[PDB]
Input
Amino acid sequence: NYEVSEKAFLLTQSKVSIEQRKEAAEFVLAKIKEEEMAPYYKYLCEEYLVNNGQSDLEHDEKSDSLNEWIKFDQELYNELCKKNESKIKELNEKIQKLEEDDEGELEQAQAWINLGEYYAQIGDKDNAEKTLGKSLSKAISTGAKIDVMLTIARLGFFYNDQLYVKEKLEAVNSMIEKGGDWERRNRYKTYYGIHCLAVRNFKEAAKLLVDSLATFTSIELTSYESIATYASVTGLFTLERTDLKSKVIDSPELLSLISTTAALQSISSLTISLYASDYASYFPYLLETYANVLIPCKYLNRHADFFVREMRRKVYAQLLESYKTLSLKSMASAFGVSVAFLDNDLGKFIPNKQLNCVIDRVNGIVETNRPDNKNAQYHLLVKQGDGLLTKLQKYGAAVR
Amino acid sequence: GVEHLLRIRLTNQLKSLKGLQSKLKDVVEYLDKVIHTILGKLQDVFNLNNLQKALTVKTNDELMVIYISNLVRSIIAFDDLIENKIQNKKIQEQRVKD
Output
């Protein structure tokens, strides 16, 4: 169901390549008709409310999409309810035979496993979670317990659930003994890496995404090119230049992606320009990547332009350590930067102490400040120490 | 056997005064007898606490490290007292239920 959530997000807000909305709208209409989900055709009305590039034309004539009618009707709804009532009749016929038999704990749990898949495919969220809790306690081992988490993670990625899904994610991880189990490792590192995306941890995102076991590729939730897509974005923050030439540029998993998928280009244009520290080539590849990567992805476009500010902060630090004193017009004719607009670009960092760059407005030259010292490092202990003493006084006076 | 019969800097500063008073009386009594090894080693003491002020800029470098070591030292002390408060709080619940 990767293309189900992808094409549904493309119809929310798209400021670039409006032609992709046609292939996205025509896909979600043919996918719901071929599936059993009733409400996901109705959710298109509420989910797109107050969004640029509206996909719904009823009272709003400002819709810029190519397919302007997502409107819900009773014609398709009644047809989807017939497939739901016909399938539950076959399952209840088998469950009734299982209740009268009751052979082991696997067949008793399999009755709820078939329901856990049924209630997930008919569009129920809380009703499906109630069915998954019954099969979790009746499981004979950890093999049937992790399949419960797979359905929880399926409904959690569509509705963006950071609480119930994250709690059950670490529950299967801990249990009694973890071990080297492939299911409790490969699946955990990929799903927990997706949860780190939305919260932007960046500490475990580089290790659990840029470094993957082999291909992942379950095809049910996320795909192969998606894991490599976030790897290029998250690999530019925590991973320094030492790991860029090992797990990024020289990574064997990213060598065959260039000749396979050419629509990404985030592992070449961004990596080569940063490794060579050339601002001339690095600038035009920012908007080309921003359009075809950040915007289409669901966990990226929520932030978007903030990443442009953070990615440009990386290249400013690469040049700052390469010189002490430099003229402003030198990088203008070489790296293709505007002198008049350079002060406004660097004005979002230097006063916030994000960069050590110092530009002299008299002669038009840039200098370099001290990158690190003992004084700037003790300031982190001041804010961390004062913030810790608050809990000691708060919890100390609360208990009495 | 000593423990059977019987049962830092403040003491050192009092010992430094004893060595200074010995040199004060040695100079006064020397002038009354007049108007060599002591005078040779005396001028080396002054030239090896006015001279300690030149390293004061570099002295405070390791002085704040003591306060940094004492800052994390005091924070750990709370974990000992707060745990005792939690331990004493559980003792109070055991006496009421008994």
